[PDB]
Amino acid sequence: SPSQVRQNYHQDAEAAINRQINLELYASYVYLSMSCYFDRDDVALKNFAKYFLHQSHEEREHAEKLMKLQNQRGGRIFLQDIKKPDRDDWESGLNAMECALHLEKSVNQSLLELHKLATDKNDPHLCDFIETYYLSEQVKSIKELGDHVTNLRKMGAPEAGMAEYLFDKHTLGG
Amino acid sequence: SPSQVRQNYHQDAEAAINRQINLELYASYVYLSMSCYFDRDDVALKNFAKYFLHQSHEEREHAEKLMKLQNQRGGRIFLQDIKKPDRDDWESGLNAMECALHLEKSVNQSLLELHKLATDKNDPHLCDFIETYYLSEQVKSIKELGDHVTNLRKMGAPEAGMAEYLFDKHTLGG
Amino acid sequence: SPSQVRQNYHQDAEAAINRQINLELYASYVYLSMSCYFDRDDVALKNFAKYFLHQSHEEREHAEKLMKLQNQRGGRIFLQDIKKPDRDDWESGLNAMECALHLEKSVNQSLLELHKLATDKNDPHLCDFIETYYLSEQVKSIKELGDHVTNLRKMGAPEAGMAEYLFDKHTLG
Amino acid sequence: SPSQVRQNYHQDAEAAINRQINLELYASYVYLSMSCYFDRDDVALKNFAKYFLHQSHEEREHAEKLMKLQNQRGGRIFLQDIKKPDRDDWESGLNAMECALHLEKSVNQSLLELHKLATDKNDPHLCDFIETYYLSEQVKSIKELGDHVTNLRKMGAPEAGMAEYLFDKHTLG
Amino acid sequence: SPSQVRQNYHQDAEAAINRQINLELYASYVYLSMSCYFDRDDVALKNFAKYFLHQSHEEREHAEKLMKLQNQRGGRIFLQDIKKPDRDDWESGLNAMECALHLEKSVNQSLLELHKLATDKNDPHLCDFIETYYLSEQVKSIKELGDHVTNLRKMGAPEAGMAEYLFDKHTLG
Amino acid sequence: SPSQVRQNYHQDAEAAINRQINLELYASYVYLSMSCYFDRDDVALKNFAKYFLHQSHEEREHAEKLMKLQNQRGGRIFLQDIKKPDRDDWESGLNAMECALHLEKSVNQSLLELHKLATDKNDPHLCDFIETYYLSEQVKSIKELGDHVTNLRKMGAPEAGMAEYLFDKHTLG
Ligand SMILES: [Fe+3]
Ligand SMILES: [Fe+3]
Ligand SMILES: [Fe+3]
Ligand SMILES: [Fe+3]
Ligand SMILES: [Fe+3]
Ligand SMILES: [Fe+3]
Ligand SMILES: [Fe+3]
């Protein structure tokens, strides 16, 4: 019945990876929607779009790595519907960063509980895997997104329209 | 209020793109699933997996180009749920190619009707856009999957053991 | 009388090319006027000048390619006067971008009508020629101009001083 | 049963491609004959021969590119006899160019008939395939051949001796 | 009020530069009409068109430089209609060279009058500008067009049709 | 009536070359049929396709060299209809090789008769021409196709599915 490679891999941990894979693919789809917003003619911020397009592809990459982990440990992949993002119009550059900040913190919460579940079942490989390739990256993203909000707020976006334009050119342009 | 860049871009075409975007994103999620199936330890065909992963990212690329088209013509993007693949287990190498063959014909089928619509609304830009970047790619990709199914069939897949193993090395290896 | 190389080229289509050849040359002259407005000392926006001068050269290049299409298909070119632009002063960078957008949209409306006639006279080469080299760039340029107008509106041009100046260095530079 | 890759590909389109294939091969054979004529010791125009040899191999490629299309869409390649050229002695450099001009307009006419068949059966892939790789090249080859005739006529060929000799070196060489 | 940069720049000179700008744009637009003529399938002189297109682009660059002068000195550019060429059919290469020689001499005439105008108003910058970038160039152009008209006559154009063909390859190639 | 270059070139040998030209053009056509067959979606052997397409073009090179031979010896090229291949469906990789083997032996027989006839008429140049560029080349093609026929039979083609698929990669790739 079980996979020939399976060893110290609980069936609950297997299910939480399938949930995370879906939650990672959900993140990718949200960031893709954001990118499209800033590429609109009535928004027209290419480096906001380019930034969020890059973030979308990393989430696609994060989803694929869990799928490889699932198969590595002997667990089987089962995919669900990827839900559409909560909103289509994201208003402005600032709001998108704040929705993204919340999105990454939600993903981080799912990973922490996943790591908590991995610890409870004495799964040190899965605890190492989440520690190395995910928890560090989420802390880095959450801090980065927090910085972008901190500056945009100070600059006076979105009321002062010259704020988001100058952010797009300097911070996201290099 | 409406798009200042909009011109001769009928509102049904705008909607037909939104459904076409979801179709290309679906196809990517179908290919992603297939790639991971051959990555399982009880299937273990590396170049089958690597092949379908490439097809998935091309279907992702195709979706993003339609999303760019939507913004170019002054349309507005509205996203739906990306539905899961009809099955989780893809039986064998031959079967996945046959499922991919049929999938591409459904994607092409939609594009033809999208061209038919675009021709009836007298939109030469959207007609040439589909002609240039999609109909050529679909006919080429269907022919390719037709060739693979043939070779895997003649070789005796999947009951004959070396059929898919040798095909993974020779044809899908390079 | 008819040319040795003439085949499936309707006389209505032939004349429609010459009208377009004039419209492309007119668009070039409009863009040359715009470019010079920013070259003025009391406007002094050097990248707005480079931008519209480049568009002025490409509209000439578009006009040159339509002329080449006329001779390829055996039709005869008949040039008309080139009209002057409807205004000399363009006020600001934003206003010039908004005018340019309407110009490109009006040129596209001429190209769309030209494609219609080709379909109604069963000329597939002429339809392809317009599709391949013209409609693609119009939508692309229109979209680009739409972006420039959107950004400038939000920044607060032309009444906010640094709006157009900074746009000059960042987007156009 | 039909092919596994077949979709929106009519029976008349499939069969029209087979005729179009034989036409391109026939044209290749015509150009091949022209080329070998100028290699004769009593004609001896090397760049006339090398020019028409080049047009022979490009037709062969056009014929091979249709066969590629035939297999992609799920149709099947039925071949036919390639008819010998209507004449062997092409007389002069001017006459061969006039005969090639006629031949290229005939092939272009057949591709136009093929396009409206593809248009009638709502096959946009076959319409684009013809638009992209054939119609545009046929207009160029007809125009190119027309230009060559026009010069040779003004030079005074074939009565004028150095007309075809110098055209060989300058325009073709 | 006068521009901040305006100094020793008379309004008649300002107005005459704008009339010159139009004449430079007219000169350009004439050359393009010539270029289009030689690209025709019944004329088919490739380097003739090459030559006349080059002159069109240079006359365009001459006008753009005169516009830059207008803004440099403080003047303001007022554009006018660019009149169409006084004929559509240019008949021959020899005739187009004679019409071009005629054109350049007329443009030189205008600049000679623009120079004395500047001389009268004691404008040493504008006198130098015209001497440096225009008067020397117009004499060079007229001399070159003199040479081609001369060479084309002595060769026997346009009755000997091989003459214009060989002048296309050897002098303009 | 006799060509200025012609010497020791019997008119039977001239007529025989014209038949060989047609036979080489036939052989080129048969290979083109075979190549296209393996490019079908339901066959899908891309290197078999490449192998026979290469032979088709080398048969055209053989034909063209014979056409150059004809003009060198003052003979005149008279072209006939290129007959269509005996079949459209070539069945399998094995069958195509055996048909190719039969074709190369048919062509070789026609060459040996052409050489025999050339030896009867004491035409030592024509004998050497067929020895140097055709006879030695044919023996190789027949030997090479002999190997491919043997290996496919040994592997158990086409009944064993992997036979021709694997032969496609290792031998022909
Ligand atoms: Fe993630
Ligand atoms: Fe796709
Ligand atoms: Fe344009
Ligand atoms: Fe089209
Ligand atoms: Fe052709
Ligand atoms: Fe000038
Ligand atoms: Fe041979």
Author numbering:
A (entry chain L), B (entry chain S): 4 to 177
C (entry chain T), D (entry chain U), E (entry chain W), F (entry chain P): 4 to 176
From the article:
The structures of wild type apoHFt-LBT and HFt-LBT Tb(III) were determined by X-ray crystallography at 2.85 Å and 2.65 Å resolution, respectively. They both crystallized in I222 space group with 24 identical subunits in the asymmetric unit (ASU) with a solvent content of 64.7%. However, the model building process allowed to position residues just from 3 to 176 since the LBT loop was not visible, probably because of the intrinsic high flexibility of the C-terminus region. In a similar way, in each ferroxidase center and 3-fold axes of wild type apoHFt-LBT structure, a significant electron density peak was indeed observed and ascribed to iron ions (refined with occupancy <100%), since, although no salt was in the crystallization solution, the X-ray fluorescence scan displayed the presence of residual iron atoms. As a matter of fact, residual iron (5 atoms per ferritin 24-mer) is consistently present in recombinant ferritin H-homopolymers, most likely due to iron uptake within bacterial environment. Accordingly, the crystals of wild type apoHFt-LBT lacked these emission energies.
Ferritin is a cage-like protein made of 24 subunits arranged in octahedral 432 symmetry with an outer diameter of roughly 12 nm and an inner diameter of 8 nm. The symmetrical positioning of three or four subunits in the protein shell results in the formation of eight channels connecting the inner cavity to the outside and allows for the entry and exit of iron and other cations with a relatively broad selectivity. In the present paper, a high Tb(III) affinity LBT sequence has been genetically fused at the C-terminal end of the heavy chain of mouse ferritin. The tag has been designed to be located inside the 250 Ǻ3 wide inner cavity such that the lanthanide ions diffusing through the surface pores could eventually bind to the LBT sequence.
